[PDB]
A paper describes a structure:
Kinesins are a family of microtubule-based motors that play important roles in intracellular transport and cell division. Whereas kinesin-1 in solution is mostly loaded with ADP, ADP release is accelerated several thousand-fold upon microtubule binding.
Using these T87A crystals as seeds, we were also able to crystallize wild-type apo-kinesin-1 and the T92V mutant and to determine their structures. Whereas most of the following analysis was performed taking the apo-T87A structure as a reference, identical conclusions could be reached from these wild-type apo-kinesin and T92V isomorphous structures. Taken together, these observations suggest that the P-loop destabilization in nucleotide-free T87A, as well as in the isomorphous structure of wild-type apo-kinesin and of T92V, is the combined result of ADP release and of the loss of the T87-E236 interactions. Whereas we demonstrated that, in the absence of microtubules, apo-kinesin-1 may adopt two conformations, ADP-kinesin-like and tubulin-bound apo-kinesin-like, the effect of tubulin binding is to shift the balance between them and to stabilize the tubulin-bound apo-kinesin-like conformation, from which ADP is released and which is primed to bind ATP6.
Author numbering: 6 to 194, 197 to 239, 243 to 324
Amino acid sequence: ESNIKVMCRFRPLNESEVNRGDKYIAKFQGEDTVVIASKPYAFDRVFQSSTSQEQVYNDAAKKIVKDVLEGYNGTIFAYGQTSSGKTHTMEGKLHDPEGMGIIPRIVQDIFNYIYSMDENLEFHIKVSYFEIYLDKIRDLLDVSKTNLSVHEDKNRVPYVKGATERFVSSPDEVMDTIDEGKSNRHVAVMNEHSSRSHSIFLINVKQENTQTEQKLSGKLYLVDLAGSEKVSAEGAVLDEAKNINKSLSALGNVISALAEGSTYVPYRDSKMTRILQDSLGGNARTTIVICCSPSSYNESETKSTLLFGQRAKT
């Protein structure tokens, strides 16, 4: 009923960390569940370390991509604490086909589809890239715009006023756009390269059918979530933490309302969920990719992650 799928990916394992003296802590009872500290967590799918990039994309994103090319909206969330493998899962290696993670594979599927239609279909792809930072909407493609707003049009379709829309005509133009924006996202520092905001990448695929003169329009949102911080330097990083946690809780409330089939879903309680209202719940398709470390050293954070993912399971 909810249309939301939660998928948990576990990472290997690496040499540097085996030499520190860590245990694997994660046990699997089938395609379903991960068991950590004797507690079971069931999801829509659990990927162990042997699961390839391509098969993660196939399970998580491929049919969402098809649906947007058929005129639907969709959303993919990436959640994980640092070193959970969130970036390997979402981006991977640029031009490596085995290889590349979810986002470049999406871009590759879209343009293959386009190239294979050629005659019959005319495409215009608009991309946007912005972050939710300290509850402000900042454009990552134009840093001069640091405080945008969300609105609804006449048919209650959400839009970000003033956000940069770039036309793109090839996979390279798309990845370039991603890179420009990454260079502007708020990161920091006792972890390391720690996102201090949520990022939203929008792929808007507009179609016109040559033969029939009929238009199609689909929105695909790629949301990279900053991890919840258990922070009590009591200054700007504090404000960052409290905002990250609130927005995650607001998202979790909506996610949970949808998963439990609530007749009222509280989209209004945060800027992100207002932005995502036509692409999260209803006839939209969503995958939540939560990334976890197997390491014993990470055990409480992957627990934090798993429980957040559970807010979304029916």
